[PDB]
Write a protein that binds this ligand. Structure first.
Ligand code: CA
Length: 484
């Protein structure tokens, strides 16, 4: 088995399945000059070549291409053995270098193919190089809030210091009242199994609301985690609205069964940021009760990775039709305005500056970036990865999905042009630690949801949990600098 020498360039016309070299797309010449005797015209049948490597590794794929069938661009597919990666190649009437991404080559032979999905593009040469990765250490971690507290900025800088070098362990605690009051169940499970505690603990402020609000002691547990155990805190905010908002009046007691965070309410999402509306009055009351708790944290000098208004896009859309939370119901543009509203309200009116603002993004399409509030309003990008049931592409149907989802990571990275750190804010399965390292899927941290998502081996196997939690690549509670 002779091993490929890098950089490796082939004439595409020499690929398996290419046949005799082309010199024009029938009557239409590609402008410029092709290398060699001509080019490969990929129509409805694949072209391919082999690369052999000694070990698993990441490699950069580039090709000198043209594409003259579709003025608006045409989907193309590069494939490594059995795995497909999709790229949209713009209209190119002249030979142009195109970046077909960095992908994993595995030990031994690798069939690299361009598949007819959707084909009808021209290939002059193809080049394979050893991958080069973004400089994660050079990401500027100055917080977007100019008045950010010293604790918040120091936390963000610590995160930046391990970004690309490690992944930080995390775990969401149970909803208020859950586990018959035992909020430590999930955490003691991890400890007894792996010998480690997660470094990051996930919370939620949903029960501090104007409808059925009570005191589930979240704020105290956040303080306990950070100030007494030396951990890192993150928190979401599943703030509900009344289902029947027409009959609702401010101050009404509404049972949680008659509330929702979904898209089934008569609550007009777009109006929550419009002065003089009941939507706005309720939204402001909810923000007030939230800010009250966040202020307590700021008072006790506790920084927080705050992830409000999360999973905004939901399923692929920009008009709101795919969202499953009410704040995304009115579309991307309205959603971003709502995010900015909350950001401005908390930082200016409530003078809160202890927050690291994490916004969820998805990677369904390029339009997914329309749900991004911008560099000046966001400190971190979160991805919620549930791929054990839907969106599963690891070749399995059931059980743990150990896929690193590396393409999702780099899609999100390029969205923000590597100006924000990216994490797995939520997941079912934690990716395999070997997949994370080999593929350089530099997710800042991971965080299974509560209940079955950590406790059930169909989501996370015990052997995998022990392996990643005791891995040098994974930061656990003991590894943190902060005082316990
Ligand atoms: Ca050629």
């Amino acid at each position: 088995e002779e091993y490929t020498k890098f950089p490796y360039t082939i004439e595409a016309e020499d690929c398996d399945g290419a046949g005799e070299p082309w010199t024009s797309v029938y009557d239409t010449k590609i402008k410029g000059m092709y290398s060699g005797k001509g080019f490969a015209y990929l129509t409805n049948a694949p072209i391919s070549f082999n690369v052999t490597v000694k070990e698993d590794g990441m490699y950069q794929f580039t090709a000198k291409v043209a594409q003259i069938l579709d003025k608006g661009g045409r989907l193309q597919t590069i494939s490594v053995n059995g795995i497909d990666y999709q790229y949209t190649v713009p209209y190119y009437d002249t030979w142009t270098d195109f970046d077909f991404g960095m992908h994993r080559l595995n030990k031994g032979a690798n069939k690299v193919s361009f598949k007819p999905i959707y084909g009808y593009a021209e290939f002059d040469t193809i080049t394979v190089e050893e991958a080069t990765f973004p400089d994660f250490s050079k990401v500027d971690t100055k917080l977007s809030d100019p008045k950010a507290t010293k604790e918040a900025q120091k936390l963000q800088d610590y995160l930046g210091s391990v970004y690309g070098k490690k992944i930080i362990s995390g775990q969401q605690e149970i909803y208020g009242g859950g586990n018959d009051g035992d909020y430590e169940l999930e955490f003691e499970y991890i400890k007894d199994l792996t010998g480690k505690y997660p470094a990051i603990r996930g919370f939620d402020f949903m029960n501090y609301n104007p409808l059925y609000g009570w005191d589930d002691q979240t704020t105290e547990r956040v303080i306990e985690w950070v100030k007494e155990r030396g951990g890192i805190a993150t928190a979401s905010w599943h703030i509900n609205v009344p289902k029947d908002f027409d009959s609702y009046e401010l101050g009404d007691k509404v049972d949680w069964q008659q509330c929702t965070y979904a898209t089934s309410s008569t609550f007009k999402t777009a109006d929550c940021i419009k002065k003089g509306t009941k939507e706005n009055d309720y939204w402001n009351e909810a923000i007030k009760m939230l800010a009250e708790q966040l202020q307590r944290l700021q008072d006790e000098k506790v920084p927080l990775i705050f992830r409000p208004l999360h999973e905004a896009e939901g399923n692929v859309n920009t008009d709101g039709s795919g969202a499953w939370f009410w704040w995304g119901k009115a579309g991307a543009k309205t959603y971003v305005e709502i995010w900015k509203y909350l950001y401005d309200k908390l930082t200016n009116e409530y003078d809160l500056h202890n927050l690291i603002w994490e916004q969820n993004l998805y990677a369904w399409s390029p339009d997914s970036i329309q749900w991004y509030a911008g560099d000046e309003y966001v400190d971190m990008i979160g991805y919620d990865k549930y791929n054990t049931v839907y969106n599963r592409h690891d070749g399995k149907t059931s059980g743990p999905n150990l896929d690193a989802e590396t393409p999702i990571f780099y899609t999100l990275l390029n969205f923000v042009e590597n100006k924000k750190m990216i994490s797995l804010a939520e997941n079912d399965s934690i990716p395999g630690v070997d997949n994370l390292i080999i593929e350089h899927a530099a997710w800042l941290y991971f965080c299974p949801w509560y209940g079955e998502f950590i406790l059930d081996e169909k989501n996370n196997a015990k052997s995998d949990l022990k392996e990643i939690y005791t891995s040098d690549y994974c930061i656990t509670l003991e590894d943190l600098p902060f005082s316990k």
